[PDB]
Design a protein around this ligand. Structure first.
Ligand SMILES: [Cl-]
Ligand SMILES: [Cl-]
Ligand SMILES: [Cl-]
Ligand SMILES: [Cl-]
Ligand SMILES: [Cl-]
Ligand SMILES: [Cl-]
Ligand SMILES: [Cu+2]
Ligand SMILES: [Cu+2]
Lengths: 28, 28, 28
């Protein structure tokens, strides 16, 4: 359970990073 | 604690999916 | 492990809210 929670949170982080990259290009 | 963590991640994933739609709508 | 997970989710929630506001300002 704990390892799956770490696994899912890390995937959210890289999903957050792509969202911030998308917004930065939109505002360009 | 573990059950609340799982729910928070599940709620976060649904917010991520809606954010992606808002960004895709902006690109249209 | 439990502390890092809860402190990582709290940071992700702050990012989600800022992303939602950034997207809302884009739609303005
Ligand atoms: Cl387990
Ligand atoms: Cl584990
Ligand atoms: Cl507990
Ligand atoms: Cl529990
Ligand atoms: Cl620990
Ligand atoms: Cl802990
Ligand atoms: Cu489509
Ligand atoms: Cu409002």
């Amino acid at each position: 359970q704990i390892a799956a929670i770490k696994e899912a949170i890390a995937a959210i982080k890289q999903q957050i990073a792509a969202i911030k990259x998308a917004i930065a290009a939109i505002k360009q």
